[PDB]
Amino acid sequence: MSRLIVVSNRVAIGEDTRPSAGGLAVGVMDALQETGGVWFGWNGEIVGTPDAAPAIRRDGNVTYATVGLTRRDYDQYYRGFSNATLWPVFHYRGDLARFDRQEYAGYLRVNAMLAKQLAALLRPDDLIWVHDYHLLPFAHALRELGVKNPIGFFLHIPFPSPDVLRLVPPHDELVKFMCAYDVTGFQTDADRQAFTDYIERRGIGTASEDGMLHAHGRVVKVAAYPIGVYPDAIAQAAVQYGARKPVKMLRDALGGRKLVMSVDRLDYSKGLVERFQAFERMLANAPGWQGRVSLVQIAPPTDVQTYQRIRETLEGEAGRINGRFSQLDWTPIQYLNRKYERNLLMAFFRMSQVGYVTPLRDGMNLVAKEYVASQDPADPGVLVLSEFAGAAAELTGALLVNPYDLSQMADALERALSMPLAERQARHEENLARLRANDLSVWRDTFVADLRSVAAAAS
Amino acid sequence: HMSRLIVVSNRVAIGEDTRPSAGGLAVGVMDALQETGGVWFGWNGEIVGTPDAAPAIRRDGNVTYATVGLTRRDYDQYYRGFSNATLWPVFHYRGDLARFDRQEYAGYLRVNAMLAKQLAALLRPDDLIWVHDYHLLPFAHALRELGVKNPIGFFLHIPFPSPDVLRLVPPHDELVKFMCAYDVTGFQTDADRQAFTDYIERRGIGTASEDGMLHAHGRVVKVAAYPIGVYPDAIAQAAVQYGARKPVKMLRDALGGRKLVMSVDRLDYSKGLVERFQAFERMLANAPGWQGRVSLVQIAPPTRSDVQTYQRIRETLEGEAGRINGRFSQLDWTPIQYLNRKYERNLLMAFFRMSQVGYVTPLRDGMNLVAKEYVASQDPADPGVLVLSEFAGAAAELTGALLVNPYDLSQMADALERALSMPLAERQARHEENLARLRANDLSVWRDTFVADLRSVAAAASVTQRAGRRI
Ligand code: NA
Ligand code: NA
The missing domain is CATH 3.40.50.2000 (Glycogen Phosphorylase B;)
Structure with a gap:
């Protein structure tokens, strides 16, 4: 079967892979194991110069592909636009937001840098699953590199209504990035509807009878997948x-x-x-x-x-x-x-x-x-x-x-x-x-099922 | 003859300029008050020791000004309490500045109920009542509690926030119920109108019918945007x-x-x-x-x-x-x-x-x-x-x-x-x-279209009130 490729802030290393540690690993590990998949992301380390390529470690059926971050890359990913602007606005604390053009450029830059690192590992039928707001531009960066794979996004934080989202000055470009995914998932129906309200009411796209969104020349499955527990x-x-x-x-x-x-x-x-x-x-x-x-x-x-x-x-x-x-x-x-x-x-x-x-x-x-x-x-x-x-x-x-x-x-x-x-x-x-x-397997199984449906419709 | 327009607002100012170049609510409503021989009801700008027993009555030409003073307690609960500490910041999308307090909210309801009882004795059955802005949001509901069946319209001069932001006001459900006590609820922009409609529809409070009316809290509400212009x-x-x-x-x-x-x-x-x-x-x-x-x-x-x-x-x-x-x-x-x-x-x-x-x-x-x-x-x-x-x-x-x-x-x-x-x-x-x-969309459009919608409420009620032959 096609590999699942998980893209996230931090690849779980060592004791953080135990189910008792919680985190993203318990959510995705069964699917990585079933598909012989790959988990790509940061190793938690700061490096003096950028890594030439991800380091590769295999544990049984799963491959862990990790890079360090330079100080500049770390600052642009964690101490720039995503936390100074996106996080506070999406949590309805936009009084705390501070938009800066250079930080936004850095956010785009680090996403493109990581997409380039990942793209060389991909097989054409890999199913790519990107997690949360630091990586929102990731599919768009992959599309610019010619990646035609199924790509899904899951947003773990709220998605604000259009009136509140517009506090983020590049909101239109961010929504365009979210339409580069074949599947865009949210925690709750209210998050899903806020995204749909932006697309529909601003004349960016339409909902077809099947519920898909047609926007930015693409067709997007938009749904809620509330994360549960065991x-x-x-x-x-x-x-x-x-x-x-x-x-x-x-x-x-x-x-x-x-x-x-x-x-x-x-x-x-x-x-x-x-x-x-x-x-x-x-x-x-x-x-x-x-x-x-x-x-x-x-x-x-x-x-x-x-x-x-x-x-x-x-x-x-x-x-x-x-x-x-x-x-x-x-x-x-x-x-x-x-x-x-x-x-x-x-x-x-x-x-x-x-x-x-x-x-x-x-x-x-x-x-x-x-x-x-x-x-x-x-x-x-x-x-x-x-x-x-x-x-x-x-x-x-x-x-x-x-x-x-x-x-x-x-x-x-x-x-x-x-x-x-x-x-x-x-x-x-x-x-x-x-x-x-709605235990945790529902989130995993339904989101992966929707990625597989993209591939099925593709062939 | 036509029915009196009753304007209800924060302040009745004596002899305010109403030439077309002027500003203020007076220039927006005076032509309608003059045309209908109406009444402007509200505060006279004075503080009084004990509540006024009944409003003072002053005539200027064809318009009646019906005014009360406010006690310090009434002034504080109206201007230095829930409306400005909670409603105003949330409706301007500043939930971080809001400070909700139960006793202030009770005071907001209390002063609205107080002012409504003062107005009610001055009403004639066909009067058209036009209430202005967020300090007086509960005013129609208080009038309804007194048995007032007149057409009543509300115009919100500030934004109306989307439901996710409105819910930062803890009594949001009751406020929206108050807003449905009006026969006409008017907003500045289509976005404000849609935010209110979104609250009603998506929270299961009511439904829009084919004519665009909202059916909610046992009432039929005309919901529309009337952007205020100038001359x-x-x-x-x-x-x-x-x-x-x-x-x-x-x-x-x-x-x-x-x-x-x-x-x-x-x-x-x-x-x-x-x-x-x-x-x-x-x-x-x-x-x-x-x-x-x-x-x-x-x-x-x-x-x-x-x-x-x-x-x-x-x-x-x-x-x-x-x-x-x-x-x-x-x-x-x-x-x-x-x-x-x-x-x-x-x-x-x-x-x-x-x-x-x-x-x-x-x-x-x-x-x-x-x-x-x-x-x-x-x-x-x-x-x-x-x-x-x-x-x-x-x-x-x-x-x-x-x-x-x-x-x-x-x-x-x-x-x-x-x-x-x-x-x-x-x-x-x-x-x-x-x-x-x-x-x-000059200032007369706001005045004329809102008053016309109030008159439409009256005409519709007249139609259902009779089924027998006329003429
Ligand atoms: Na217990
Ligand atoms: Na000039």
């Missing part, structure tokens, strides 16, 4: 890690007090000051909960200036809140800037009574799904979920909140902590059924 | 009439033959005034031959109301002007004249006519009448060039402007340079293109 594997890990030292230490320190879990990387889409302040407001509104519940916020370390500014802000907010309420043997907010292995987080989730997942905007949010899947069905926790996370379209048993009303989040936390078992179980089973009906 | 011939005449005034002569002498870029904005976060200044700076850096040969005049009529925002923006702009003037100024050249001053309207038109470029690039604007006033002021024998933000409502009409994305400073700088050097023939082609649009 709920049975998560539940098993949640159980298996319940006696590990970090879990026991938290269990012991809580002394039977209730636990709210929250896990986020530090960026301005997460609303973490709001997260802390709504927990503060809950304790002020219902002081009977003081001394009886703690919030644990975990942030894996990761823009050095943005990360450090948020971390200092949150350290100050946690310190202020704790100074207002803390008692003997009670810390209201435990803010941990640490990387725990995924399976430990699942054990933390299972122990907790509330999962507090309220980003201001999120393309999906896998923590919300992992939280549900970790719960003991005989005593399950309650998910409090932002309506602006993609997962909200699926997790209909969550307590949904608009994080722009701090009192809504405070009210939801109080309701979650007080919820009778029978309702917690009804909501849990409702969410778990949805997780089981 | 361009009146503006041009006023500009010429003021061409000899001392300040015009003063400015011309101060320029010393230099080209003039004009910009006039109130200070708020939708205007992008930092970007405005920085793109002018970038143009002077990119095309240094323009140094000493062009000046930017930025006029910002003071609006000390919302003191924190006004002072913060003013401080930021003073720093930017200080930096840019420090970079480029010479012995006899101030690159950016930044004037926190109020000028007579007709003087501004004369300044527009003198200038070569109108620089109107807000980050977001429901319409922007300065852009239309700029074009209307030009001498067609040597007309200036309008540089216009694509996020201003007027961009849908002023197709002869150099349209720019104000988030792209280099594009704005390039447009300024192109505008300043544009050959006469192209300047005239663009000017006449824009002027023809202004003349085909």
